Each structure stands twice: as C-alpha cells, then as structure tokens.
Amino acid sequence: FEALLGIYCNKIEWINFFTTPIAVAANVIRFNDVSRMTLGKVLFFIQLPRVATGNDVTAPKETTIMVAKHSEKHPINISFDLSAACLEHLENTFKNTVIDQILNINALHTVLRSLKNSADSLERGLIHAFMQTLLRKSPPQFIV
Amino acid sequence: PRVATGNDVTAPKETTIMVAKHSEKHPINISFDLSAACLEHLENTFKN
C-alpha cells in the first residue's frame, strides 16, 4: 500500500495596518470620493518674529511667508481570477449528488479564501506604498 | 499572500504550491544463539 498520511496546509497570518508600527507615522482617513479628487493642497502662513536692533543696524522688516504643499496621488490594485469550471460549480448544483456537493463547497471555499487573500494584499499594498513614499521623501543623514 | 503593486505595475498571480515529503525505511536486527547442550539443560531434566 502507498500510505497517504496527513494533509497539512499553510497559515496566512493576517496584517492590520494599525497593528504595524508604521501607522504612527501614518494618519489614515477615509474620504469616499478621492477617486474624483484631482489635487489636494494645504496652505501654510508663517510669520517670523524679529529682534530689536542696536546702534548702526537697519531693523529688518516683518517677514511673512506663504507656502503650499500639494498632494501626491497613488492607486493600488490586486487581481485574482477564477476559472470557468469554478464559476460553473460555484453557482449551481446540477444534480444534488455527493460529488457535486463536494465541488460546490470547494468552489465556495476558493472564492472566500481568495477574497481574504486579496484583502490582506490590499493592506500590505497600503504598507508598501506608504513605505515607498517615505523613502522618496526622506533625505539621508549626512545631508540632513 | 501577495502585495498590491503601485501605479500600473503588473501584479503576480495567485501562487499555490504543493509538496510531498516521502518516507525512508530502515530495518534493524539482533541475532543470538543457544547451544545444543544448553538447550538440553533448558527444560527436560534427565535425572533429579
């Protein structure tokens, strides 16, 4: 006999964005229509305090400085595909036979497991895109 | 598990891997003997 012992599977460990400690640098907001947003911009209005000057020195003027920071925009996406046989056995039991019930439950677990894997992949895509942007922003230490 | 690619980079597809580890098998033995004279003195007492 050809002994088929126990069948073991993988554990996909799950990731939440806020659980990871990059989210202390992040600050994460649902805005439902950012799809429609072309630009976002913040506008800063600084004024600098002067110091009184002594003898023989021109006192400087009231310096007012206005700047504006734009918003980078960055999409992410995940595809996963289902086969046509999976789509057929997902939606009906043709006859109510035992094999057909087995395949119906396998198609259902295929769809569910792929949905969970894709949601995890969107979380990790948020992780990686945010790390990408911090690395593009960050100048190195000798320059700083 | 995958990760979401950025702007218009083609993501890898859904990777499912199957492995099958096999069994070695290996015998052991021990031989030991009893002599004919010992086997005579084992149970059938000739005299008392």
Side-chain angles (χ1 to χ4, degrees):
Chain A
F1 50 88
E2 182 266 331
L4 201 288
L5 299 177
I7 298 100
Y8 295 94
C9 68
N10 193 7
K11 282 180 68 177
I12 295 98
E13 66 176 1
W14 304 105
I15 300 299
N16 292 320
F17 184 77
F18 297 145
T19 304
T20 60
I22 184 61
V24 62
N27 193 359
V28 182
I29 303 159
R30 273 191 282 175
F31 182 83
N32 290 317
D33 296 334
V34 73
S35 69
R36 289 182 175 96
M37 184 181 291
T38 299
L39 288 172
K41 56 170 71 66
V42 295
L43 291 86
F44 293 147
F45 180 75
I46 318 297
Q47 285 188 355
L48 295 174
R50 300 186 304 276
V51 60
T53 66
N55 200 357
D56 280 331
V57 173
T58 299
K61 291 180 180 179
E62 185 182 359
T63 300
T64 298
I65 297 171
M66 297 177 288
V67 303
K69 305 291 288 295
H70 290 286
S71 68
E72 194 274 338
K73 60 183 180 293
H74 193 77
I76 56 173
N77 50 1
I78 277 295
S79 63
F80 73 99
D81 47 356
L82 298 180
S83 67
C86 185
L87 188 64
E88 287 182 353
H89 292 285
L90 193 276
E91 55 89 16
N92 58 357
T93 62
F94 301 105
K95 305 176 183 67
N96 195 3
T97 64
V98 181
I99 290 175
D100 199 2
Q101 288 174 354
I102 300 300
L103 269 72
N104 195 5
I105 300 166
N106 284 314
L108 183 61
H109 281 82
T110 297
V111 172
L112 288 175
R113 177 184 46 72
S114 61
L115 289 169
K116 295 175 177 63
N117 196 359
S118 65
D120 191 8
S121 297
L122 284 177
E123 292 292 325
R124 293 180 182 180
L126 179 59
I127 294 288
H128 178 72
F130 187 71
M131 193 63 208
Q132 190 78 39
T133 295
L134 286 179
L135 284 167
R136 290 178 183 175
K137 282 173 65 179
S138 299
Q141 189 63 41
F142 59 95
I143 296 171
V144 171
Chain B
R2 295 188 300 276
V3 64
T5 61
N7 193 0
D8 291 331
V9 177
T10 300
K13 293 181 181 180
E14 178 168 355
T15 306
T16 298
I17 294 186
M18 275 161 224
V19 305
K21 298 295 289 182
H22 295 284
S23 66
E24 192 272 337
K25 66 180 176 297
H26 183 74
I28 60 170
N29 58 1
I30 284 298
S31 65
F32 64 97
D33 59 353
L34 295 173
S35 68
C38 181
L39 187 60
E40 290 176 356
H41 294 292
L42 252 298
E43 60 89 19
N44 48 358
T45 180
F46 294 99
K47 293 182 180 180
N48 193 0

Short mmCIF file of all heavy atoms in Angstrom, two decimals, chain A residues 52-104:
data_model
loop_
_atom_site.label_atom_id
_atom_site.label_comp_id
_atom_site.label_asym_id
_atom_site.label_seq_id
_atom_site.Cartn_x
_atom_site.Cartn_y
_atom_site.Cartn_z
N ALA A 52 14.90 93.29 18.16
CA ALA A 52 15.24 94.70 18.12
C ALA A 52 16.73 94.86 17.92
O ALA A 52 17.54 94.11 18.46
CB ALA A 52 14.81 95.41 19.39
N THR A 53 17.09 95.86 17.13
CA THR A 53 18.47 96.03 16.74
C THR A 53 19.09 97.18 17.51
O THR A 53 18.42 98.15 17.87
CB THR A 53 18.60 96.32 15.26
OG1 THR A 53 18.01 97.59 14.99
CG2 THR A 53 17.88 95.26 14.48
N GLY A 54 20.39 97.07 17.71
CA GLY A 54 21.14 98.08 18.41
C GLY A 54 21.53 99.22 17.51
O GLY A 54 20.86 99.56 16.53
N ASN A 55 22.63 99.85 17.89
CA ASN A 55 23.14 101.01 17.19
C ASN A 55 23.69 100.62 15.82
O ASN A 55 24.25 99.53 15.65
CB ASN A 55 24.22 101.65 18.05
CG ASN A 55 24.47 103.06 17.69
OD1 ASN A 55 23.89 103.58 16.75
ND2 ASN A 55 25.31 103.73 18.45
N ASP A 56 23.48 101.50 14.84
CA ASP A 56 24.06 101.43 13.49
C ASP A 56 23.60 100.21 12.69
O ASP A 56 24.31 99.77 11.79
CB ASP A 56 25.59 101.46 13.51
CG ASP A 56 26.14 102.85 13.66
OD1 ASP A 56 25.47 103.80 13.23
OD2 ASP A 56 27.27 102.99 14.19
N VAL A 57 22.43 99.64 12.97
CA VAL A 57 21.95 98.48 12.24
C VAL A 57 20.53 98.74 11.78
O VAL A 57 19.69 99.18 12.57
CB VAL A 57 22.02 97.19 13.09
CG1 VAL A 57 21.35 96.03 12.39
CG2 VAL A 57 23.46 96.82 13.38
N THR A 58 20.26 98.50 10.50
CA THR A 58 18.90 98.55 9.98
C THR A 58 18.05 97.46 10.62
O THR A 58 18.41 96.28 10.58
CB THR A 58 18.89 98.35 8.47
OG1 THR A 58 19.63 99.40 7.84
CG2 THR A 58 17.47 98.35 7.94
N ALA A 59 16.94 97.86 11.22
CA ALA A 59 16.00 96.88 11.72
C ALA A 59 15.32 96.18 10.55
O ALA A 59 14.87 96.86 9.62
CB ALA A 59 14.96 97.54 12.61
N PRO A 60 15.25 94.86 10.54
CA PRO A 60 14.64 94.15 9.41
C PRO A 60 13.12 94.30 9.43
O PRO A 60 12.52 94.79 10.38
CB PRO A 60 15.07 92.70 9.64
CG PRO A 60 15.28 92.61 11.10
CD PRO A 60 15.80 93.94 11.54
N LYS A 61 12.51 93.86 8.34
CA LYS A 61 11.08 94.06 8.14
C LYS A 61 10.29 92.81 8.50
O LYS A 61 10.83 91.72 8.64
CB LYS A 61 10.81 94.46 6.69
CG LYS A 61 11.32 95.83 6.33
CD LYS A 61 11.00 96.15 4.89
CE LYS A 61 11.50 97.51 4.49
NZ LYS A 61 11.20 97.80 3.07
N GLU A 62 8.98 92.99 8.62
CA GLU A 62 8.07 91.94 9.08
C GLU A 62 7.92 90.89 8.00
O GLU A 62 7.12 91.04 7.08
CB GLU A 62 6.72 92.55 9.44
CG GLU A 62 5.72 91.59 10.05
CD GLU A 62 4.39 92.24 10.34
OE1 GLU A 62 4.26 93.46 10.07
OE2 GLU A 62 3.46 91.55 10.81
N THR A 63 8.67 89.81 8.11
CA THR A 63 8.70 88.81 7.05
C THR A 63 7.50 87.88 7.19
O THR A 63 7.31 87.23 8.23
CB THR A 63 10.00 88.01 7.09
OG1 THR A 63 11.10 88.91 6.91
CG2 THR A 63 10.01 86.97 6.00
N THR A 64 6.70 87.82 6.13
CA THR A 64 5.52 86.96 6.04
C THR A 64 5.71 86.00 4.88
O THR A 64 5.97 86.43 3.76
CB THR A 64 4.27 87.81 5.84
OG1 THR A 64 4.09 88.67 6.96
CG2 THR A 64 3.07 86.93 5.68
N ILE A 65 5.56 84.71 5.14
CA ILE A 65 5.93 83.67 4.19
C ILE A 65 4.75 82.73 4.02
O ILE A 65 4.30 82.12 4.99
CB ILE A 65 7.16 82.89 4.66
CG1 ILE A 65 8.37 83.80 4.76
CG2 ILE A 65 7.44 81.75 3.73
CD1 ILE A 65 9.56 83.18 5.42
N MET A 66 4.29 82.57 2.79
CA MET A 66 3.13 81.73 2.49
C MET A 66 3.57 80.64 1.54
O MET A 66 4.07 80.94 0.46
CB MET A 66 2.03 82.55 1.84
CG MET A 66 1.46 83.63 2.68
SD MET A 66 0.26 84.50 1.69
CE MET A 66 1.36 85.36 0.58
N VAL A 67 3.37 79.38 1.92
CA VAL A 67 3.72 78.27 1.05
C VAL A 67 2.51 77.36 0.87
O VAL A 67 1.49 77.53 1.53
CB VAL A 67 4.91 77.44 1.56
CG1 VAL A 67 6.14 78.29 1.78
CG2 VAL A 67 4.55 76.73 2.81
N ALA A 68 2.65 76.37 0.00
CA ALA A 68 1.55 75.48 -0.33
C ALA A 68 2.09 74.11 -0.68
O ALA A 68 2.95 73.99 -1.56
CB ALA A 68 0.73 76.04 -1.49
N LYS A 69 1.60 73.08 -0.01
CA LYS A 69 2.04 71.72 -0.25
C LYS A 69 0.94 70.96 -0.98
O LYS A 69 -0.20 70.94 -0.53
CB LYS A 69 2.38 71.02 1.06
CG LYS A 69 3.40 71.75 1.90
CD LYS A 69 4.78 71.73 1.28
CE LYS A 69 5.39 70.35 1.36
NZ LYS A 69 5.66 69.94 2.76
N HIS A 70 1.30 70.32 -2.09
CA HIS A 70 0.32 69.57 -2.85
C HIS A 70 0.24 68.13 -2.35
O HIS A 70 1.01 67.69 -1.50
CB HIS A 70 0.65 69.58 -4.33
CG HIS A 70 0.45 70.90 -4.97
ND1 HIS A 70 -0.80 71.41 -5.25
CD2 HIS A 70 1.33 71.84 -5.38
CE1 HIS A 70 -0.68 72.60 -5.81
NE2 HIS A 70 0.61 72.88 -5.90
N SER A 71 -0.72 67.40 -2.91
CA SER A 71 -0.98 66.02 -2.55
C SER A 71 -0.54 65.11 -3.67
O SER A 71 -0.98 65.27 -4.81
CB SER A 71 -2.46 65.81 -2.28
OG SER A 71 -3.19 65.94 -3.48
N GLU A 72 0.30 64.14 -3.35
CA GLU A 72 0.59 63.08 -4.30
C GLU A 72 -0.60 62.13 -4.33
O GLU A 72 -1.29 61.94 -3.33
CB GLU A 72 1.86 62.35 -3.88
CG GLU A 72 2.48 61.45 -4.91
CD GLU A 72 1.90 60.06 -4.90
OE1 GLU A 72 1.33 59.67 -3.86
OE2 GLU A 72 2.02 59.34 -5.91
N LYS A 73 -0.87 61.54 -5.49
CA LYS A 73 -1.94 60.56 -5.58
C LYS A 73 -1.41 59.26 -6.17
O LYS A 73 -0.58 59.27 -7.08
CB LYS A 73 -3.13 61.08 -6.40
CG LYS A 73 -2.82 61.45 -7.82
CD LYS A 73 -4.06 62.02 -8.50
CE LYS A 73 -3.77 62.40 -9.94
NZ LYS A 73 -2.83 63.56 -10.03
N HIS A 74 -1.89 58.15 -5.64
CA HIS A 74 -1.22 56.88 -5.87
C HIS A 74 -2.24 55.76 -5.72
O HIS A 74 -2.81 55.57 -4.64
CB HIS A 74 -0.07 56.74 -4.88
CG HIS A 74 0.88 55.64 -5.19
ND1 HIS A 74 1.84 55.74 -6.17
CD2 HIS A 74 1.04 54.42 -4.63
CE1 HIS A 74 2.54 54.63 -6.21
NE2 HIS A 74 2.08 53.81 -5.29
N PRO A 75 -2.57 55.05 -6.78
CA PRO A 75 -3.53 53.95 -6.64
C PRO A 75 -2.84 52.63 -6.40
O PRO A 75 -1.64 52.52 -6.68
CB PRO A 75 -4.25 53.95 -7.98
CG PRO A 75 -3.22 54.42 -8.92
CD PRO A 75 -2.38 55.43 -8.18
N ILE A 76 -3.55 51.63 -5.89
CA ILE A 76 -3.06 50.26 -5.82
C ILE A 76 -4.18 49.33 -6.23
O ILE A 76 -5.36 49.67 -6.16
CB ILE A 76 -2.55 49.86 -4.42
CG1 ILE A 76 -3.63 50.09 -3.39
CG2 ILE A 76 -1.28 50.61 -4.05
CD1 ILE A 76 -3.27 49.58 -2.04
N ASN A 77 -3.81 48.12 -6.66
CA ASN A 77 -4.81 47.17 -7.12
C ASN A 77 -4.27 45.75 -7.05
O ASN A 77 -3.06 45.51 -7.08
CB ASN A 77 -5.27 47.50 -8.53
CG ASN A 77 -4.13 47.70 -9.48
OD1 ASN A 77 -2.96 47.58 -9.11
ND2 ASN A 77 -4.46 48.00 -10.72
N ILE A 78 -5.21 44.82 -6.95
CA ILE A 78 -4.94 43.39 -6.87
C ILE A 78 -5.93 42.65 -7.74
O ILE A 78 -7.14 42.84 -7.62
CB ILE A 78 -5.02 42.88 -5.41
CG1 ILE A 78 -3.71 43.14 -4.72
CG2 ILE A 78 -5.34 41.41 -5.33
CD1 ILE A 78 -2.58 42.34 -5.34
N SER A 79 -5.42 41.82 -8.63
CA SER A 79 -6.28 40.97 -9.42
C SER A 79 -6.20 39.54 -8.92
O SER A 79 -5.16 39.11 -8.42
CB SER A 79 -5.90 41.03 -10.90
OG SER A 79 -4.60 40.54 -11.10
N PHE A 80 -7.31 38.83 -9.02
CA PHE A 80 -7.28 37.39 -8.89
C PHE A 80 -8.35 36.85 -9.81
O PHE A 80 -9.39 37.47 -9.99
CB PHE A 80 -7.50 36.93 -7.45
CG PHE A 80 -8.90 37.08 -6.97
CD1 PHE A 80 -9.77 36.00 -6.97
CD2 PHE A 80 -9.35 38.29 -6.50
CE1 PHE A 80 -11.05 36.13 -6.53
CE2 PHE A 80 -10.64 38.43 -6.06
CZ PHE A 80 -11.49 37.34 -6.07
N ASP A 81 -8.11 35.69 -10.39
CA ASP A 81 -9.02 35.17 -11.39
C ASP A 81 -9.62 33.85 -10.94
O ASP A 81 -9.02 33.10 -10.17
CB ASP A 81 -8.30 35.02 -12.72
CG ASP A 81 -6.97 34.34 -12.58
OD1 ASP A 81 -6.56 34.07 -11.44
OD2 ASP A 81 -6.32 34.11 -13.62
N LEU A 82 -10.83 33.59 -11.41
CA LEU A 82 -11.49 32.32 -11.19
C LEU A 82 -11.65 31.60 -12.52
O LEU A 82 -11.89 32.24 -13.55
CB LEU A 82 -12.86 32.50 -10.55
CG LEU A 82 -12.84 33.14 -9.18
CD1 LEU A 82 -14.24 33.26 -8.65
CD2 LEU A 82 -11.98 32.33 -8.26
N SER A 83 -11.51 30.29 -12.49
CA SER A 83 -11.68 29.53 -13.72
C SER A 83 -13.16 29.40 -14.05
O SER A 83 -14.04 29.61 -13.21
CB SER A 83 -11.05 28.16 -13.59
OG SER A 83 -11.76 27.38 -12.65
N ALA A 84 -13.43 29.05 -15.31
CA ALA A 84 -14.81 28.92 -15.74
C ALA A 84 -15.49 27.71 -15.13
O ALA A 84 -16.69 27.74 -14.86
CB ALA A 84 -14.89 28.85 -17.26
N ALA A 85 -14.72 26.64 -14.87
CA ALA A 85 -15.29 25.49 -14.18
C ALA A 85 -15.61 25.84 -12.73
O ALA A 85 -16.62 25.38 -12.19
CB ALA A 85 -14.32 24.31 -14.24
N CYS A 86 -14.78 26.68 -12.12
CA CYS A 86 -15.08 27.17 -10.77
C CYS A 86 -16.32 28.04 -10.77
O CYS A 86 -17.14 27.94 -9.86
CB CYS A 86 -13.88 27.93 -10.22
SG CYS A 86 -14.08 28.46 -8.53
N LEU A 87 -16.48 28.85 -11.81
CA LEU A 87 -17.66 29.70 -11.90
C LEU A 87 -18.92 28.88 -12.14
O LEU A 87 -19.99 29.24 -11.66
CB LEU A 87 -17.46 30.72 -13.02
CG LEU A 87 -18.52 31.80 -13.12
CD1 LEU A 87 -18.47 32.62 -11.86
CD2 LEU A 87 -18.28 32.66 -14.35
N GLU A 88 -18.80 27.79 -12.89
CA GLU A 88 -19.95 26.92 -13.11
C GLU A 88 -20.35 26.20 -11.83
O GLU A 88 -21.52 26.23 -11.44
CB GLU A 88 -19.66 25.89 -14.20
CG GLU A 88 -19.63 26.44 -15.60
CD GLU A 88 -19.37 25.35 -16.61
OE1 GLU A 88 -19.10 24.21 -16.19
OE2 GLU A 88 -19.45 25.63 -17.83
N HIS A 89 -19.40 25.57 -11.15
CA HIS A 89 -19.76 24.85 -9.94
C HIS A 89 -20.00 25.76 -8.75
O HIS A 89 -20.48 25.28 -7.72
CB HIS A 89 -18.68 23.84 -9.59
CG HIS A 89 -18.59 22.71 -10.56
ND1 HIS A 89 -19.52 21.70 -10.60
CD2 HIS A 89 -17.69 22.44 -11.53
CE1 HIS A 89 -19.20 20.85 -11.55
NE2 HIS A 89 -18.09 21.28 -12.14
N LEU A 90 -19.69 27.04 -8.86
CA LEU A 90 -19.95 27.95 -7.76
C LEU A 90 -21.43 28.29 -7.68
O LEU A 90 -21.95 28.51 -6.58
CB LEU A 90 -19.09 29.21 -7.93
CG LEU A 90 -18.89 30.25 -6.83
CD1 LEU A 90 -19.99 31.28 -6.74
CD2 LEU A 90 -18.73 29.54 -5.51
N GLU A 91 -22.11 28.36 -8.81
CA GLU A 91 -23.42 28.96 -8.85
C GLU A 91 -24.57 27.96 -8.84
O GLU A 91 -25.70 28.36 -8.54
CB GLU A 91 -23.55 29.87 -10.07
CG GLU A 91 -23.25 29.22 -11.39
CD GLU A 91 -24.45 28.59 -12.04
OE1 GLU A 91 -25.58 28.89 -11.62
OE2 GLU A 91 -24.26 27.79 -12.99
N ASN A 92 -24.34 26.69 -9.18
CA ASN A 92 -25.43 25.73 -9.10
C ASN A 92 -24.93 24.35 -8.73
O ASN A 92 -23.78 23.99 -8.99
CB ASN A 92 -26.24 25.65 -10.40
CG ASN A 92 -25.40 25.29 -11.61
OD1 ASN A 92 -24.18 25.14 -11.54
ND2 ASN A 92 -26.07 25.13 -12.74
N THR A 93 -25.81 23.58 -8.10
CA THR A 93 -25.70 22.13 -8.09
C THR A 93 -26.56 21.63 -9.24
O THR A 93 -27.76 21.90 -9.28
CB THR A 93 -26.19 21.56 -6.77
OG1 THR A 93 -27.58 21.88 -6.60
CG2 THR A 93 -25.42 22.16 -5.63
N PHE A 94 -25.93 20.93 -10.19
CA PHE A 94 -26.67 20.47 -11.36
C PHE A 94 -27.68 19.41 -10.97
O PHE A 94 -28.89 19.63 -11.04
CB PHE A 94 -25.70 19.91 -12.40
CG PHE A 94 -24.69 20.90 -12.86
CD1 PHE A 94 -23.38 20.81 -12.42
CD2 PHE A 94 -25.03 21.89 -13.75
CE1 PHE A 94 -22.44 21.71 -12.85
CE2 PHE A 94 -24.09 22.80 -14.18
CZ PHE A 94 -22.79 22.71 -13.73
N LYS A 95 -27.19 18.28 -10.50
CA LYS A 95 -27.99 17.34 -9.75
C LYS A 95 -27.52 17.42 -8.31
O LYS A 95 -26.44 17.93 -8.03
CB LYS A 95 -27.84 15.93 -10.30
CG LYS A 95 -28.15 15.87 -11.77
CD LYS A 95 -27.91 14.50 -12.34
CE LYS A 95 -28.17 14.52 -13.83
NZ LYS A 95 -27.17 15.37 -14.52
N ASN A 96 -28.34 16.94 -7.39
CA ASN A 96 -27.94 17.01 -5.99
C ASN A 96 -27.23 15.71 -5.64
O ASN A 96 -27.72 14.86 -4.90
CB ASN A 96 -29.15 17.26 -5.10
CG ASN A 96 -28.76 17.69 -3.71
OD1 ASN A 96 -27.58 17.85 -3.41
ND2 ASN A 96 -29.76 17.85 -2.85
N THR A 97 -26.03 15.57 -6.19
CA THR A 97 -25.21 14.40 -5.94
C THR A 97 -24.06 14.77 -5.02
O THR A 97 -23.77 15.94 -4.78
CB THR A 97 -24.66 13.80 -7.24
OG1 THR A 97 -23.79 14.75 -7.86
CG2 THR A 97 -25.79 13.49 -8.17
N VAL A 98 -23.39 13.72 -4.53
CA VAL A 98 -22.40 13.90 -3.47
C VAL A 98 -21.17 14.61 -4.01
O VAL A 98 -20.68 15.57 -3.41
CB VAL A 98 -22.05 12.55 -2.85
CG1 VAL A 98 -21.06 12.76 -1.75
CG2 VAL A 98 -23.29 11.88 -2.33
N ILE A 99 -20.68 14.15 -5.16
CA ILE A 99 -19.54 14.78 -5.83
C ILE A 99 -19.83 16.23 -6.17
O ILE A 99 -18.99 17.11 -5.96
CB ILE A 99 -19.18 13.96 -7.09
CG1 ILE A 99 -18.57 12.63 -6.69
CG2 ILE A 99 -18.25 14.72 -8.00
CD1 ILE A 99 -18.31 11.73 -7.85
N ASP A 100 -21.05 16.51 -6.63
CA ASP A 100 -21.40 17.88 -6.98
C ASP A 100 -21.46 18.77 -5.74
O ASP A 100 -21.06 19.93 -5.80
CB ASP A 100 -22.74 17.91 -7.71
CG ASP A 100 -22.95 19.19 -8.50
OD1 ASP A 100 -22.03 20.04 -8.51
OD2 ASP A 100 -24.03 19.35 -9.12
N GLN A 101 -21.89 18.22 -4.60
CA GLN A 101 -21.87 19.00 -3.37
C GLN A 101 -20.45 19.28 -2.92
O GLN A 101 -20.16 20.39 -2.44
CB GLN A 101 -22.65 18.27 -2.28
CG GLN A 101 -24.13 18.29 -2.49
CD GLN A 101 -24.86 17.45 -1.48
OE1 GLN A 101 -24.24 16.76 -0.67
NE2 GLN A 101 -26.18 17.51 -1.50
N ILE A 102 -19.55 18.29 -3.06
CA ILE A 102 -18.14 18.49 -2.73
C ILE A 102 -17.55 19.62 -3.56
O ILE A 102 -16.87 20.51 -3.03
CB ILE A 102 -17.34 17.19 -2.93
CG1 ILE A 102 -17.86 16.05 -2.07
CG2 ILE A 102 -15.88 17.40 -2.59
CD1 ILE A 102 -17.81 16.32 -0.63
N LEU A 103 -17.83 19.62 -4.86
CA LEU A 103 -17.27 20.66 -5.71
C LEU A 103 -17.91 22.01 -5.44
O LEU A 103 -17.24 23.04 -5.61
CB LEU A 103 -17.44 20.32 -7.18
CG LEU A 103 -16.28 19.56 -7.83
CD1 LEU A 103 -16.23 18.15 -7.35
CD2 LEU A 103 -16.42 19.59 -9.33
N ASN A 104 -19.17 22.04 -5.02
CA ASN A 104 -19.79 23.31 -4.68
C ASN A 104 -19.13 23.92 -3.46
O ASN A 104 -18.84 25.13 -3.43
CB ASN A 104 -21.28 23.10 -4.43
CG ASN A 104 -22.04 24.39 -4.41
OD1 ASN A 104 -21.49 25.45 -4.69
ND2 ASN A 104 -23.32 24.31 -4.07
#
